[PDB]
Amino acid sequence: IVGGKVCPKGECPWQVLLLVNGAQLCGGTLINTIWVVSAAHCFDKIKNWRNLIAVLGEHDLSEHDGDEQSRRVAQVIIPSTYVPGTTNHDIALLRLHQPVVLTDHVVPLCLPERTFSERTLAFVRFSLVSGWGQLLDRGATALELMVLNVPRLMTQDCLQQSRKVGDSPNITEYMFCAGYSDGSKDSCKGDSGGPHATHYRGTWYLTGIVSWGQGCATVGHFGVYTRVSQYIEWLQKLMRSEPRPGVLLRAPFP
Amino acid sequence: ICVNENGGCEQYCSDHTGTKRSCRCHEGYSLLADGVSCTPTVEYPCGKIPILEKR
Numbered sequence A: 001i002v003g004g005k006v007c008p009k010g011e012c013p014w015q016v017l018l019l020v021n022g023a024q025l026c027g028g029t030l031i032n033t034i035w036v037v038s039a040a041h042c043f044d045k046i047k048n049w050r051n052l053i054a055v056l057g058e059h060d061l062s063e064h065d066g067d068e069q070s071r072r073v074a075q076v077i078i079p080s081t082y083v084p085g086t087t088n089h090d091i092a093l094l095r096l097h098q099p100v101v102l103t104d105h106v107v108p109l110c111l112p113e114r115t116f117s118e119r120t121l122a123f124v125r126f127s128l129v130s131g132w133g134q135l136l137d138r139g140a141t142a143l144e145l146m147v148l149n150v151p152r153l154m155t156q157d158c159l160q161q162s163r164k165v166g167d168s169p170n171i172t173e174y175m176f177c178a179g180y181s182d183g184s185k186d187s188c189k190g191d192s193g194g195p196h197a198t199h200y201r202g203t204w205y206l207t208g209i210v211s212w213g214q215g216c217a218t219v220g221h222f223g224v225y226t227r228v229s230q231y232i233e234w235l236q237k238l239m240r241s242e243p244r245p246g247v248l249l250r251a252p253f254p
Numbered sequence B: 001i002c003v004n005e006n007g008g009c010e011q012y013c014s015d016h017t018g019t020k021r022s023c024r025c026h027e028g029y030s031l032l033a034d035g036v037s038c039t040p041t042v043e044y045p046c047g048k049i050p051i052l053e054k055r
Ligand SMILES: Cc1cc2ccc1[C@@H](C)COC(=O)Nc1ccc(C3(C(=O)O)CCC3)c(c1)CN(C)C(=O)[C@@H]2Nc1ccc2c(N)ncc(F)c2c1
Pocket: A025, A026, A041, A042, A043, A044, A045, A085, A086, A087, A169, A186, A187, A188, A189, A190, A191, A192, A210, A211, A212, A213, A214, A215, A216, A217, A222, A223, A224
């Protein structure tokens, strides 16, 4: 996260840290005690599917304070329409091997209904994006969880306000732009999979997933986020399904 | 009705045959008698920050 601030410990209790062989992989969002939403692209390079860990209640990577809860990732569910190395349908649904225990430091973010999300949440201007990503483009990643308030753009407005660079991917109906074009504030590659959380009448909801962009906090470019409202039905149906042998599962989308 | 100001609902809104509207809540919440407000029924409802709620 560039140009944000430290999220005060316990103020981002749905934030997940994903690890592979103990190394920082990506962010994620807890939506109930056993399910985590992340980005499909986070899993493009995994070979050791059995060494994937989700950490809840994390804040400071340098110290164990006893609020952290680690769980093995039993299943990674990706839509059939996602193509590795590309941008569209950038979402993953992760089943934890054992539920996390809800505490003051571990709380799920609300996964909203599609109607509420499209009709109401999509018009809340500012939302929060968080993670342990890069503090600067080509800089070190954060040791404490960071958070940034970003404004959402209508896609027509994102395309008009952006620098017309060659070989740049399209912004589909499965995405949305959010952030700033002045190079001061953005989420980064290390924040991938993390929440874009929207506040509405006293409650926080999942509206986006940190997905992609053209360099972190690059002038003329906004951050691109997976449009979670398009996946509500797909996610709900999978959360009602029985686990299947093998970690990775490709599931039909829609 | 649901398209306009969330039909007055705090959380979810369903439109019904005519000028009828029903508000609903996420799991771990129940709807109050005003028919619009959602109140937690569990210790850790989704989308609420305990350190901020306990202040
Ligand atoms: C999907 C995608 C992601 C990213 C860049 C490009 C692409 C597409 C075009 C090609 O597709 C890819 O490049 N795919 C891909 C697959 C695996 C990895 C992982 C890696 O580290 O190799 C595995 C764990 C992430 C990685 C990228 C790393 N990486 C560059 C990324 O995550 C980066 N993320 C963001 C996320 C948010 C960004 C933001 N708001 N503002 C500015 C940025 F610039 C941002 C970059």
